[PDB]
Design a binder for this molecule. Structure first.
Ligand SMILES: [Mg+2]
Ligand SMILES: [Mg+2]
Ligand SMILES: [Mg+2]
Ligand SMILES: [Mg+2]
Ligand SMILES: [Mg+2]
Ligand SMILES: [Mg+2]
Ligand SMILES: [Mg+2]
Ligand SMILES: [Mg+2]
Ligand SMILES: [Mg+2]
Ligand SMILES: [Mg+2]
Ligand SMILES: [Mg+2]
Ligand SMILES: [Mg+2]
Ligand SMILES: [Mg+2]
Ligand SMILES: [Mg+2]
Ligand SMILES: [Mg+2]
Ligand SMILES: [Mg+2]
Ligand SMILES: [Mg+2]
Ligand SMILES: [Mg+2]
Ligand SMILES: [Mg+2]
Ligand SMILES: [Mg+2]
Ligand SMILES: [Mg+2]
Ligand SMILES: [Mg+2]
Ligand SMILES: [Mg+2]
Ligand SMILES: [Mg+2]
Ligand SMILES: [Mg+2]
Ligand SMILES: [Mg+2]
Ligand SMILES: [Mg+2]
Ligand SMILES: [Mg+2]
Ligand SMILES: [Mg+2]
Ligand SMILES: [Mg+2]
Ligand SMILES: [Mg+2]
Ligand SMILES: [Mg+2]
Ligand SMILES: [Mg+2]
Ligand SMILES: [Mg+2]
Ligand SMILES: [Mg+2]
Ligand SMILES: [Mg+2]
Lengths: 51, 185, 52, 147, 103, 68
RNA sequence: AGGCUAAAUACCGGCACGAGACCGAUAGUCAACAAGUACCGUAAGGGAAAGUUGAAAAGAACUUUGAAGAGAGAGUUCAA
RNA sequence: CGGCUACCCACCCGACCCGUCUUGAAACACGGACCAAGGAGUCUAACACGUGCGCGAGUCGGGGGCUCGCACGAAAGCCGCCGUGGCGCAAUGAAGGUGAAGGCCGGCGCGCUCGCCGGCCGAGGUGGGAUCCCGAGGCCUCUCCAGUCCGCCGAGGGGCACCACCGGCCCGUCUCGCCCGCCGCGCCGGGGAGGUGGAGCACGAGCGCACGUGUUAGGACCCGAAAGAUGGUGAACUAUG
RNA sequence: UAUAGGGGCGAAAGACUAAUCGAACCAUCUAGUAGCUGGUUCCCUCCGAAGUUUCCCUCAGGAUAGCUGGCGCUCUCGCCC
RNA sequence: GUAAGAAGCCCGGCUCGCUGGCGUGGAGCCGGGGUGGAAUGCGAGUGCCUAGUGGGCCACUUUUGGUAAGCAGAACUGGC
């Protein structure tokens, strides 16, 4: 059958920078960049046009 | 003379359920509350006549908090009705409790802590007059039916959750819930 | 097939024996036990009928 | 049960529990939700506010699979894994933390609730709330983003 | 028509529905027919297993179910080519082939 | 078809059948309609009370207990 | 902008079968019986009522009254 | 001899003919000559409340599959890596989206209308609140001695549920200003203090089955129109060639 | 023998069209709808009204409030206050 | 219409970003002490669901239109 299997990843020691690795601000910045990707490109284009 | 509209007490004096064990518990606690002259026996006899709604299921964490209060070290917690397990707490004290129809998930969680539980007949055999006891009850108004009650969902201070077929947009939102369409409550 | 109160059933996966409400279903022994009658009230079997 | 219904005890009463002055006429007030805006406006505005009109913008061809995002709370974050994991973490043999993946249980977002145990955890989820993210780091845990 | 307080209802019984009502009084007979058909097919094809054609590993498309995996229709032509067996012989071997699926 | 227009006959009986009892008077009635500035000041005084209460009031309680 | 194909699906008509917490002759299909029959209207069409002797006819031989219908005796049946 | 009555008769008193529309019925208001049989609040779906049951932050196999062909079997039993799924466990915005823990103690930076740090339990406080606990005091053969023996209570304490208020947290808004971060230093993100709107949170109670009532859609308590549409039959009567 | 139903025919009465004509007959939709009449079946026990406010093309009706009943639930007496 | 107490009064101390000559005023909180506060009668509070009703009439008294009416229209109370 197609019974599901799952990777274990039992336990591990937390690294040093994991306390400040990710955050809610990371997802917020990712969403903001995905929303304002093309606008920044058009702004850079019209800025290089004036030069 | 005097009107006879309120002469008959509407309270019930006999359990509507046909459970044989509940009938025997009533027959025992009636004799106790009649003889021992204990107000605790009186109230625990009155709470056995109550229906399914008037006997709300008391959770486990609520009973933990009620027993953690000062003066409840060795006192026995008594819940007329079902006590249910709570998965939000992780550790539990001894918790020597007597209840009716304890849930199986809470059975092991209480028996692993070291405390022993007992039923109503064992409680009557141990302490007839109800000494060293704490009578607890679950949230009677915590039921969802009491959230649809009030004066009316139209008064500007309703907060009464009107009955709606499906919850979401364009379902009882436009005229009477915002100042843009008509009025605001 | 049904299991006991200690171990669940083997044939049925998530079934356990029903819970038992009154551990002692004999009212006579409970009412005649010394612990119950230790703190009882007087019988007071007087009728006190209507007096003319 | 016809023997338990009310119509049996109504035999002999001519009006059948409906009165002599106003008889039981076939839909005397209207059929269905008739006249929701007039001659029923009092009831419709007292018991169903907001029923008339449109509020929000329309979304053509909405799929309930896109907005599928179940939420899990911190008080339930330990009910997903087994019980022995919690005691093995509380034993504290070294600075190792158990990994609690909510995607296996079926939750995509973790929401914040208080009273966390003092054990460090490594959580893997697609979305995190700000309060939950600060509360898991105030105890010494770690948050891992997946996709 | 309305009462003191109650949920507003919109029953879809305004059409002439009583002349088209499907009662499932033949459900046990249908289940018995299906079971007898399964048994007869298995007895006729006894050396071959029931649901003979092997089905590949298939991930759910939508984001709601893309975390779990399920069965499918047939193996792709690329998978058949990497396996090294011909396309047309897999059908008589007992391997269901899905030419529309890509990798 | 002229009919009766408006009378208040047999109304006091209907009222007195159930009762015209006064509304429920309870302590801490409400804080609605009160001046918003006064309410803000009261909230500030309530939230800043425990800052200096638990020390000076405790000292004064110890002092009066020593007095009597 | 060309085509073929069984499967699970539906079936108040048709040919047979089984069953019923249904109806029991003003009920149940209109129709338990020579029922879509008698009958009605030019026609399209409308459309009924109507079961029970007795276990077995063993359906009352014979005498008398009456022209007969019918009746008095008698006779069969546990029972006319 | 005793006997009420479903037998008959007589006297005394009271006694208008039933059903419904109506403020008003015995009416010169309507229906009923009489008798026998039939005759009217049903069933389905959905909703709300209450009650009984089982389980319980879970609940439900009604949809399929399995065991052996079965009169009772169109039943019943089981699925366990069939819980897909429905309801509930999270709400708030039109939406992009966001999305609920308080309390005590000490210290520092101007303990500043002031943040952080360390330790603890961990869902705040007030006024009521069944019940429970402690409890001065006195209540049992001659006496100082006792554990049971007789046996209630002034006052005080922690306080179920629930009630009223204050404060706290979440989401959508308006005012005020300042701070922090950089997978990249921007009309990028995050945060505070105050006023309001929410069907919210502030140790959860729902699910499935049955019953009763009430509303509604189904012909829907029963009987009743003037009318509309579809498709066919009639100039053997009558009007006209 | 020809004209057949919103059609025919009419020296015109809206007369005739199979005893029916200011729109025939037959079957179906159709158990069409009715805020309008009539009826609505056994006993006992308990409680027991309103013809009033507001709104509606509302006035022979309905919604709302009020009157009523049922199910309860939370407490209080029962041993100088 | 209101009041005739313990949800009250006297005392001390804290908080305020409200106001401000003033430790001024006003609110909130804490702490210990003192219930017998007009008569009479009575057990109260509260939640849910809900049928019927939504044509009324009459009477003492006060009253509007009308000459008047067993006329039409109102207020309290009682009755059908
Ligand atoms: Mg009465
Ligand atoms: Mg009646
Ligand atoms: Mg009505
Ligand atoms: Mg009326
Ligand atoms: Mg009604
Ligand atoms: Mg229709
Ligand atoms: Mg009127
Ligand atoms: Mg093609
Ligand atoms: Mg084709
Ligand atoms: Mg086929
Ligand atoms: Mg039957
Ligand atoms: Mg017949
Ligand atoms: Mg002869
Ligand atoms: Mg009658
Ligand atoms: Mg009438
Ligand atoms: Mg009249
Ligand atoms: Mg009459
Ligand atoms: Mg009459
Ligand atoms: Mg007449
Ligand atoms: Mg007559
Ligand atoms: Mg009959
Ligand atoms: Mg699921
Ligand atoms: Mg009809
Ligand atoms: Mg029309
Ligand atoms: Mg035609
Ligand atoms: Mg001719
Ligand atoms: Mg026409
Ligand atoms: Mg004619
Ligand atoms: Mg016509
Ligand atoms: Mg009908
Ligand atoms: Mg009216
Ligand atoms: Mg009432
Ligand atoms: Mg009542
Ligand atoms: Mg009724
Ligand atoms: Mg009049
Ligand atoms: Mg008058």
């Amino acid at each position: 059958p197609i019974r599901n299997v799952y990777k274990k990843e039992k336990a591990r020691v937390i690294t040093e920078e994991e306390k400040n690795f990710k955050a809610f601000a990371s997802l917020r910045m990712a969403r903001a960049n995905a929303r304002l990707f093309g606008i920044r490109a058009k702004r850079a284009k019209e800025a290089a046009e004036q030069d | 003379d005097i009107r006879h509209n309120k002469d008959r007490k509407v309270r019930r004096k006999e359990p509507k359920s046909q459970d044989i064990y509940l009938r025997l518990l009533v027959k025992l606690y009636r004799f106790l509350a009649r003889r021992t002259n204990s107000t605790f026996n009186q109230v625990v006899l009155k709470r056995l006549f109550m229906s399914r709604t008037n006997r709300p299921p008391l959770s486990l964490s609520r009973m933990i908090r009620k027993m953690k209060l000062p003066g409840r070290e060795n006192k026995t917690a008594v819940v007329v009705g079902t006590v249910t397990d709570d998965v939000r707490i992780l550790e539990v004290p001894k918790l020597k409790v007597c209840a009716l129809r304890v849930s199986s998930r809470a059975r092991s969680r209480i028996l692993k802590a070291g405390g022993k539980i007992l039923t109503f007949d064992q409680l009557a055999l141990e302490s007839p007059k109800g000494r060293g006891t704490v009578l607890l009850s679950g949230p009677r108004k915590g039921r969802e039916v009491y959230r649809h009650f009030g004066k009316a969902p139209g008064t500007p201070h309703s907060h009464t959750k009107p009955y709606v077929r499906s919850k979401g947009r364009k379902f009882e939102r436009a005229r009477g819930r915002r100042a843009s369409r008509g009025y605001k409550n | 097939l049904y299991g006991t109160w200690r171990k669940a059933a083997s044939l049925k996966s998530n079934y356990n024996l029903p819970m038992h409400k009154m551990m002692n279903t004999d009212l006579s022994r409970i009412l005649k036990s010394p612990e119950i009658q230790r703190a009882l009230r007087a019988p007071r079997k007087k009728i006190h009928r209507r007096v003319l | 049960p016809s023997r338990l219904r009310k119509t049996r005890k109504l035999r002999g009463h001519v009006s059948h529990g409906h009165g002599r002055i106003g008889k039981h006429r076939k839909h005397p007030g209207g059929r269905g939700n008739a006249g929701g805006m007039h001659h029923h406006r009092i009831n419709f505005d007292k018991y169903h506010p907001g029923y008339f009109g449109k509020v929000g913008m329309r979304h053509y061809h909405l799929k309930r699979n896109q907005s599928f995002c179940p939420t899990v709370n911190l008080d339930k974050l330990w009910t997903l894994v087994s019980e022995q994991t919690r005691v093995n973490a509380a034993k504290n043999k070294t600075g190792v933390a158990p990994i609690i993946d909510v995607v296996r249980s079926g939750y995509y977002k973790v929401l914040g609730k208080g009273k966390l145990p003092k054990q460090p955890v490594i959580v893997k989820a697609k979305f995190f709330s700000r309060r939950a993210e600060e509360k898991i780091k105030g105890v010494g845990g770690a948050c891992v983003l997946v996709a | 028509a309305p009462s003191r307080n109650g949920m507003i209802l919109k029953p879809h019984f305004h059409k002439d529905w009583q002349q088209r009502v499907d009662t499932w009084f033949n459900q046990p007979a249908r289940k018995i027919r299906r079971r007898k058909a399964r048994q007869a097919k298995a007895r006729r094809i006894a050396p071959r297993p029931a649901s003979g054609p092997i089905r590949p590993i298939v991930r759910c498309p939508t984001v709601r179910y893309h975390t779990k995996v399920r069965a499918g229709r047939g193996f792709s032509l690329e998978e058949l080519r990497v396996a090294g067996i011909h396309k047309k012989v897999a059908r008589t071997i007992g391997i269901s082939v899905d030419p529309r699926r890509r990798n | 078809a002229k009919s009766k227009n408006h009378t208040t006959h047999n109304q006091s009986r209907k009222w007195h059948r159930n009762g015209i009892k006064k509304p429920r008077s309870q302590r801490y009635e409400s804080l609605k309609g009160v001046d918003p500035k006064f309410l803000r000041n009261m909230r500030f005084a309530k939230k800043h009370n425990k800052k200096g209460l638990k020390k000076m009031q405790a000292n004064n309680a110890k002092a009066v207990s020593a007095r009597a």
